[PDB]
Scaffold this motif. Structure first.
Motif, PDB file in Angstrom:
ATOM      1  N   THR A 293       0.290  -1.146  -0.250  1.00 55.45           N
ATOM      2  CA  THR A 293       0.334   0.221   0.141  1.00 55.45           C
ATOM      3  C   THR A 293       0.987   1.195   0.556  1.00 55.45           C
ATOM      4  OG1 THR A 293      -1.815  -1.510   1.786  1.00 55.45           O
ATOM      5  CG2 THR A 293      -1.779   1.148   1.334  1.00 55.45           C
ATOM      6  N   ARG A 294       1.952   1.368   0.770  1.00 53.26           N
ATOM      7  CA  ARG A 294       2.851   2.217   1.070  1.00 53.26           C
ATOM      8  C   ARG A 294       3.468   3.219  -0.470  1.00 53.26           C
ATOM      9  NH1 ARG A 294       0.904   5.753   3.559  1.00 53.26           N
ATOM     10  NH2 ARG A 294       2.694   6.943   2.657  1.00 53.26           N
ATOM     11  N   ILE A 296       2.138   2.197  -3.112  1.00 55.87           N
ATOM     12  CA  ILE A 296       1.211   2.330  -4.301  1.00 55.87           C
ATOM     13  C   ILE A 296       1.048   3.620  -3.790  1.00 55.87           C
ATOM     14  CG2 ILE A 296      -1.451   2.291  -5.215  1.00 55.87           C
ATOM     15  CD1 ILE A 296      -0.444  -0.514  -4.333  1.00 55.87           C
ATOM     16  N   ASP A 297       1.154   4.295  -3.094  1.00 57.38           N
ATOM     17  CA  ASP A 297       1.464   5.154  -2.614  1.00 57.38           C
ATOM     18  C   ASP A 297       1.735   6.365  -2.990  1.00 57.38           C
ATOM     19  OD1 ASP A 297       0.463   8.039  -1.092  1.00 57.38           O
ATOM     20  OD2 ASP A 297      -1.129   7.251   0.669  1.00 57.38           O
ATOM     21  N   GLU A 298       2.779   6.245  -2.093  1.00 62.09           N
ATOM     22  CA  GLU A 298       4.557   6.385  -2.916  1.00 62.09           C
ATOM     23  C   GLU A 298       4.639   6.708  -4.866  1.00 62.09           C
ATOM     24  OE1 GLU A 298       5.353   8.734  -1.245  1.00 62.09           O
ATOM     25  OE2 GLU A 298       5.220   7.681   0.916  1.00 62.09           O
ATOM     26  N   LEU A 299       4.783   5.426  -5.407  1.00 68.50           N
ATOM     27  CA  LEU A 299       4.990   4.638  -6.373  1.00 68.50           C
ATOM     28  C   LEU A 299       4.190   4.734  -7.158  1.00 68.50           C
ATOM     29  CD1 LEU A 299       7.884   5.581  -6.776  1.00 68.50           C
ATOM     30  CD2 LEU A 299       7.586   3.267  -4.990  1.00 68.50           C
ATOM     31  N   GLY A 300       3.136   5.225  -8.418  1.00 64.96           N
ATOM     32  CA  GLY A 300       2.174   4.602  -9.200  1.00 64.96           C
ATOM     33  C   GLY A 300       1.966   3.269  -9.022  1.00 64.96           C
ATOM     34  N   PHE A 301      -0.040   3.151  -8.771  1.00 68.46           N
ATOM     35  CA  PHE A 301      -0.039   2.471  -9.051  1.00 68.46           C
ATOM     36  C   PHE A 301       0.132   0.848  -9.371  1.00 68.46           C
ATOM     37  CE2 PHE A 301      -4.299  -0.700  -9.485  1.00 68.46           C
ATOM     38  CZ  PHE A 301      -4.011  -1.722  -8.617  1.00 68.46           C
TER      39      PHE A 301
ATOM     40  N   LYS B 617      -2.779   6.002 -15.575  1.00 69.10           N
ATOM     41  CA  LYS B 617      -2.100   4.843 -15.162  1.00 69.10           C
ATOM     42  C   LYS B 617      -0.817   5.855 -14.321  1.00 69.10           C
ATOM     43  CE  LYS B 617      -5.608   2.441 -15.624  1.00 69.10           C
ATOM     44  NZ  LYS B 617      -5.727   3.417 -15.131  1.00 69.10           N
ATOM     45  N   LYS B 618       0.342   6.345 -14.507  1.00 65.13           N
ATOM     46  CA  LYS B 618       1.229   6.467 -14.177  1.00 65.13           C
ATOM     47  C   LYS B 618       0.813   7.834 -12.859  1.00 65.13           C
ATOM     48  CE  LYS B 618       3.761   5.373 -15.804  1.00 65.13           C
ATOM     49  NZ  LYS B 618       5.236   6.834 -16.877  1.00 65.13           N
ATOM     50  N   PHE B 619      -0.068   8.450 -13.093  1.00 62.07           N
ATOM     51  CA  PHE B 619      -1.028   9.073 -11.930  1.00 62.07           C
ATOM     52  C   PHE B 619      -0.541   8.351 -10.395  1.00 62.07           C
ATOM     53  CE2 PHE B 619      -3.493  12.519 -10.355  1.00 62.07           C
ATOM     54  CZ  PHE B 619      -3.810  12.788  -9.231  1.00 62.07           C
ATOM     55  N   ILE B 620       0.444   8.734  -9.564  1.00 60.34           N
ATOM     56  CA  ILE B 620       0.881   8.952  -8.010  1.00 60.34           C
ATOM     57  C   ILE B 620      -0.568   9.204  -7.235  1.00 60.34           C
ATOM     58  CG2 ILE B 620       2.570   7.996  -8.967  1.00 60.34           C
ATOM     59  CD1 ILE B 620       2.676  10.296  -5.722  1.00 60.34           C
ATOM     60  N   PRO B 621      -1.229   8.809  -6.358  1.00 59.94           N
ATOM     61  CA  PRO B 621      -2.211   9.356  -5.773  1.00 59.94           C
ATOM     62  C   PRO B 621      -1.548   9.984  -4.555  1.00 59.94           C
ATOM     63  CG  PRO B 621      -2.063   7.372  -4.607  1.00 59.94           C
ATOM     64  CD  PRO B 621      -1.041   7.281  -6.037  1.00 59.94           C
ATOM     65  N   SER B 622      -0.692   9.976  -4.218  1.00 55.54           N
ATOM     66  CA  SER B 622      -0.346  11.189  -3.349  1.00 55.54           C
ATOM     67  C   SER B 622      -0.281  12.689  -3.558  1.00 55.54           C
ATOM     68  CB  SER B 622       1.897  11.185  -3.054  1.00 55.54           C
ATOM     69  OG  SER B 622       1.159  11.675  -1.625  1.00 55.54           O
ATOM     70  N   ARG B 652      -7.949   4.911  -3.039  1.00 56.66           N
ATOM     71  CA  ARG B 652      -7.386   4.672  -2.146  1.00 56.66           C
ATOM     72  C   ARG B 652      -7.788   4.737  -0.845  1.00 56.66           C
ATOM     73  NH1 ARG B 652      -2.381   4.482  -0.840  1.00 56.66           N
ATOM     74  NH2 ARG B 652      -2.859   2.257  -1.946  1.00 56.66           N
ATOM     75  N   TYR B 661      -7.667  11.454   1.050  1.00 52.92           N
ATOM     76  CA  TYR B 661      -7.789  11.295  -0.083  1.00 52.92           C
ATOM     77  C   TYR B 661      -9.740  11.319   0.209  1.00 52.92           C
ATOM     78  CZ  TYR B 661      -3.776   9.550  -0.941  1.00 52.92           C
ATOM     79  OH  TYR B 661      -1.946   9.515  -0.484  1.00 52.92           O
TER      80      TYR B 661
END
Lengths: 670, 670
Positions: A293-294, A296-301, B617-622, B652, B661
């Motif tokens: 999860t971390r 996915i939060d830092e790097l893209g999904f 798909k590149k969008f990182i949620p942070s 998220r 989020y």
């Protein structure tokens, strides 16, 4: 402490003094000519030590190490649950005392605790004379453990076993219980090691922990490294070179498991070890989830989106099955995302699951079921079947598993509802082929045969019944029509009232003539009967006469409600059939539009009937809790109610902050 | 095991088949006449025992349990960090070996491990006098532990990482290190308890666990079990109106801390103990806000509801401060809304923070401080000042705490960037009293004086600089004019260009004439000056020339990045510049074809400039966290990305424990 042996099989010097004998040993093993130099007797001793170190996975020194692969391999029928092989071995006539020791452990694993105690006593008696300190010590400890298990088992049985089982069981004769209680008087396990020959106490010090009331406490206290949050942000990875806390913990768990199962120690069955494995595996899985999860939060999904940071293998699956309770599996399911983990070695897991199915089809299809074996085995069986959702299976193993679960499982442990949820879990990945559709049909048929009697009635904790099995089979095969249920219906008569009701529950599965004769018995004569048919019996459409019933009762209550306005009093409304008419007028079930005239009585009825002009301030968000899946979807569909209930759910999650409200808010609407 | 002594202060019968001495003891405790029946010597013995049991918190049997309340009272200067009182107690003479033992513990807690080790050895030698042997055993364990700490600290210090910290020579002299190695090489802890007299082994049998990890075993297993249980209670929504099963966690953590500190055991410094305390307090914090959302829900959806609230106090605050790292506190901040957990005993917490601040001042201002102390104490001080956000302080406390933070905190630990945010959070429960603004003014002026030298830079980690402190001062009062800074501006000359840069960064504070001098000395030419002007309001509307400079940087970075990409050393977006340009384009602050051409090197830039084409798909949620209110609202406004960002936020909130989020999804997008 001269060296630090490591889980990967790497030795490291530590507080050693003088010549490095381990480095010399490994250099000697690598080079053959140096071995040729060694004396003959020392050469044979080297061969013995080489085989020993190779077997225990000690490879070389850390500096000389490299890409060291680690593959756990526990060779024990007890661990793999080869019950038939264990019984066959037990029947075989023992040769040495080690065979007797292994046979005693197998007996204990199979529940024959009386025979295990007797055989352990024999082994002690013979081994004291044979000067086998190891066998004497381990048999003493395992006899004490089996005695503790017997005592706790009789306590549980007398206290509650008669209740949960529905009848009292006396697994142990009172004479045997008296004998063991008299034998183990004042026997304190602590003095066992301290009273041993100083030779054994010197050589076999590594076994002293076994007698101690508890161990793993250094292993348990070392699980905190899996609860670290700084690691995900920045992990040194210095718990071990080419490793981490996760790998070290997993390999330590495998070390403990292999040592206990391969040396045939009864402590594998105790609560301390079970809780240790629960804690270790739960923490490892949660750590993997947290890291994923971390990331996915830092790097893209796109990166680390569904990383299998943990990777279940055969041994992991059997661990989880044996040592977890269903509540622990549910805890892992809700906290972590077990579906994101990938399962390997699925063929061995399939063999293990079909072995479970065979064992429950023998243990219970037979008139006799060892109770002491049953209590420990059924938890593993239902945990394995519960946790088989993620593993894929072939049609043959899946067929055997479904057959055993549906028919050869105790009803005490799995009711019809829990059976259903187990089955549906099994259907997620191994989507129902026709072969097990036939098994489900047979199970439903047997349920009908039981329902012929007027006393039978399903019991379910989750509120799911055979109707759910019928819904599942029909969902996977849209046009399935069982023939046996159809002929049951045709043979049906008005005297078979409860069977009539049960077959009514399974209406979709029945053939045209079968369901025709079924619905011949029942009919609608009023709005109460109409709602009873829609609720149960699946009134497909509101016939014109049905709509006349709706309007008749609607206007009767309209006059009653006018008289209520005259009263200024309205005590209660037991069943708002008008709300049902509303969801039925919103579902386009009622082609008639007269009821639109009736509006203003119930805020819900106005909500469904004329939503556009309906005041959504009146609307109670609690109704969304009751609305079914399709009703909520439709409410999202309708433009007039869509945004208004978007607002109401937003407000509820904003103020009350309930989580079911949030589920409705997003999983359906946005 | 004759009685289960519960952590609440209640006794229960366990493995007791003989007469109940505990029940009789409590009966004597209640009735005075039955006590009078006792003989003289037995009466005095009972009096002593009564005093002991009241002290330890044992009250009565579970059958007659009253309103057993939870109260914690740790009385140890070491626990409360009364460092000056500890020093004074050390300097003064000690009348008994009890005082020598307490002094040794105080020395160890003050980071004087050489003196503490010598004193522990002295106590071990002087304990030869006939005594219970408890002080001798505890001193032996504590000197073994302090030797372990000495060796580990030496390993870290000689090892790299300290070189950043001036490569401080570890105060332990090589002769001292050799002496302790020679003394402790023959000593093994596991045989210490067995080495003690049989009398000491029969009594004081509970002191054995101190020699290994077994001391924490029971609390660790209970902690894991209760973590799983209470998290299940959370997820199931068991909004229980009664008491909670966490109180056992609190009291067990209250029993461990008190036992370790009161008995002066150095194990308080262990990492395992710190992790145990951290996990217990985090669990309690989660349940505190979990029961906080329960009360709100109960009162909102029903007139009947609970006002019961789990809230912090002095001991909770000091625990969190001492045992958490900043990342753990940040994790708790992310998951739970600590801002809504009330804190009691605010005056004691303020006094503790003031003590921390003055200890920091003493350690920094004067020299001769202990580097071994510094390491342990700095983490506690950092956590204390970071977590002081949620407690309100008086203007004196704000004064000296901010003075210690801005001036006397070591630079290697807190860079200016972290200092800014830790100052800023302290302005959350406060409104910036003019004295605090004066302190920040003096810090800014000192930074200017440093900037006079050309060989200086505001090194930072999170990208925050002195301009941020100036912006904070402006935030809490918009018309503040820094007279000292104004004089500094007017006095400089063109050759003092580093000065000019630093004052230009914090433009708004400077007086009108000072501003006239600084703006007549510096003009906006490069991109850095453009954004500095935007920050300070010098440039309010992007000029065509400023647009051309933005295009200049965009084209420069584009040429560079593409050249590296062709060469195979593709540069990565850094310094945030591109991201700001993309945001400006999306906000229509700036618009040109060249701006659209820059797409292809920062995925955020592609997302902002052309969401229609950006790959989500590149969008990182942070990213969503950094965006402001207007930016988030406008992102919700745009059609091309609203759905993609909604999907990202939904994923998220379903997976990530972050609550930002959920807020972004609900308030802005939905």
């Amino acid at each position: 402490y001269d060296y630090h042996f490591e889980v990967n099989g790497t030795v490291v010097r530590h507080k050693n003094k003088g010549f490095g004998y381990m480095e010399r040993f490994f250099e000697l093993k690598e080079s053959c000519d140096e071995r040729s130099k060694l004396s003959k007797k020392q050469y044979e001793r080297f061969n013995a030590l080489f085989n020993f170190f190779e077997k225990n996975g000690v490879i070389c020194m850390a500096k000389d190490a490299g890409t060291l692969n680690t593959s756990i391999e526990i060779n024990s029928l007890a661990y793999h649950g080869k019950y038939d092989v264990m019984k066959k071995f037990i029947e075989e006539q023992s040769v040495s005392i080690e065979d007797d020791y292994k046979k005693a452990f197998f007996l204990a694993c199979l529940g024959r605790w009386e025979e295990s105690y007797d055989l352990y006593s024999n082994i002690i008696l013979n081994s004291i004379d044979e000067s086998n300190g190891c066998v004497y010590y381990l048999s003493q400890i395992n006899r004490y453990r089996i005695y503790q298990s017997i005592t706790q088992a009789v306590t549980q049985f007398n206290g509650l076993g008669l209740l949960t089982f529905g009848r009292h069981y006396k697994p142990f004769t009172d004479e045997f219980l008296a004998r063991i209680e008299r034998e183990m008087t004042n026997f304190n396990i602590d003095d066992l090691f301290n009273g041993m020959p100083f030779e054994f106490q010197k050589k076999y010090k590594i076994l002293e922990f076994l007698s101690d009331n508890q161990f793993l406490y250094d292993d348990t206290v070392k699980l905190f490294e899996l609860t670290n949050k700084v690691r995900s942000e920045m992990s040194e990875g210095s718990y071990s070179f080419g490793m981490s806390s996760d790998i070290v913990v997993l390999l330590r768990l495998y070390d403990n498991l292999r040592f206990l199962y391969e040396n045939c120690l009864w402590s594998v069955s105790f609560h301390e070890f079970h809780q240790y494995i629960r804690n270790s595996m739960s923490l490892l899985i949660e750590k993997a989830e947290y890291e994923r999860t971390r990331d996915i939060d830092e790097l893209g999904f796109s990166f680390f989106g569904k990383k299998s940071g943990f990777f279940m293998e055969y041994y992991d699956f059997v661990n989880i099955s044996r040592h977890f309770k269903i509540d622990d599996i549910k805890n892992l399911e809700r906290s972590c995302s077990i579906d994101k983990i990938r399962f390997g070695e699925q063929e061995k897991i399939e063999e293990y699951l079909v072995g479970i199915a065979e064992e429950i089809t023998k243990q219970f299809s037979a008139n006799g079921m060892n109770v002491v074996f049953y209590t420990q085995f059924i938890s593993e069986a239902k945990a394995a079947l519960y946790f088989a959702k993620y593993v894929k299976l072939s049609e043959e193993g899946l067929g055997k598993i479904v057959k055993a679960l549906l028919f050869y499982f105790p009803e005490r442990d799995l009711d019809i509802g829990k059976r259903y949820v187990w089955l549906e879990r099994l259907t997620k990945c191994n989507e129902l082929p026709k072969s097990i559709i036939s098994i489900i049909d047979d199970f439903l048929v047997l349920q009908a045969e039981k329902h012929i009697d007027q006393n039978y009635s399903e019991v379910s904790s989750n509120g799911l019944y055979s109707r759910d099995y019928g819904a599942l089979i029909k969902h996977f095969e849209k046009n399935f029509i069982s023939k046996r249920l159809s002929e049951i219906t045709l043979c049906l008569t008005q005297d078979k009232q409860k069977q009539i009701d049960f077959l009514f529950k399974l209406l979709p599965l029945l053939s045209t003539n079968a369901k025709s004769h079924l619905l011949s018995f029942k009919s609608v004569e009023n709005i109460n009967d109409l709602m009873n048919g829609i609720r149960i019996g699946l009134i497909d459409e509101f016939t014109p006469e049905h709509e006349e019933l709706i309007i008749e009762y609607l206007e009767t209550r309209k006059v009653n409600y006018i008289v209520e306005k005259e009263k200024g009093i309205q005590t209660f409304s037991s069943n708002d059939y008008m709300s049902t008419f509303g969801i039925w007028y919103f579902l386009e079930e009622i082609n008639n539009s007269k009821m639109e005239e009736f509006i203003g009585m119930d805020d819900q009825y106005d909500f469904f009937v004329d939503p556009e002009n309906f005041d959504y301030k009146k609307f109670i968000p609690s109704w969304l809790k009751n609305y079914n899946d399709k009703l909520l979807g439709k409410i999202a569909g309708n433009k007039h109610m869509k945004h208004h209930v978007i607002e109401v759910l937003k407000e509820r999650v904003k103020n009350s902050n309930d989580k079911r409200y949030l589920e409705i808010l997003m999983n359906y609407f946005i």
